[PDB]
Amino acid sequence: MRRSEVLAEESIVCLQKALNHLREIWELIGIPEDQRLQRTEVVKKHIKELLDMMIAEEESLKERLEH
Amino acid sequence: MRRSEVLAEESIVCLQKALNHLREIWELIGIPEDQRLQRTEVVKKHIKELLDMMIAEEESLKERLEH
Structure with a gap:
């Protein structure tokens, strides 16, 4: 960070x-092991939220310096 | 998981x-690095949410096999 x-x-x-x-x-x-993957897959979607802010942090905050 | x-x-x-x-x-x-630690502290708080599930899974979902 x-x-x-x-x-x-x-x-x-x-x-x-x-x-x-x-x-x-x-x-x-x-x-059941299917409820556990959906618990992992939501831990992983919180990191996908962190991928989304990151591709916004390079593209858009480098663009704060541009604009 | x-x-x-x-x-x-x-x-x-x-x-x-x-x-x-x-x-x-x-x-x-x-x-400013205070935006970045607020970005870190929210990544952390998503893991706190996962801690809060798990203490509820042992205490309360082990008690779901009970009752």
């Missing part, structure tokens, strides 16, 4: 912990 | 990748 990458790295360290404990819970409760 | 850990691990590759490219844009545009 800025040169303080450490908060973003902690954010995805924390998602790495969380996705492992969610998968221990899967193997423990035995909920 | 389920034992397909891969779909979520690739979600956080793609964030790790994006957050570095967003830091390249920081060194280039020189937009």
Whole structure:
């Protein structure tokens, strides 16, 4: 994000912990594995939101310097 | 998430990748870094949302197999 990458790295360290404990819970409760992919696919769409702001941050904020 | 850990691990590759490219844009545009940590803090808060699901999945969805 800025040169303080450490908060973003902690954010995805924390998602790495969380996705492992969610998968221990899967193997423990035995909920259908289709609801779990939709839970992963929404963690991934929040990162697709971060891809969308990024292609806007290069194209459009470089264009804040232009206009 | 389920034992397909891969779909979520690739979600956080793609964030790790994006957050570095967003830091390249920081060194280039020189937009004030307080917008960038608000961008980081919202990426983080989407993982807090995932923490809040998971504590509800162990406490409350393990109790869903109970009752």
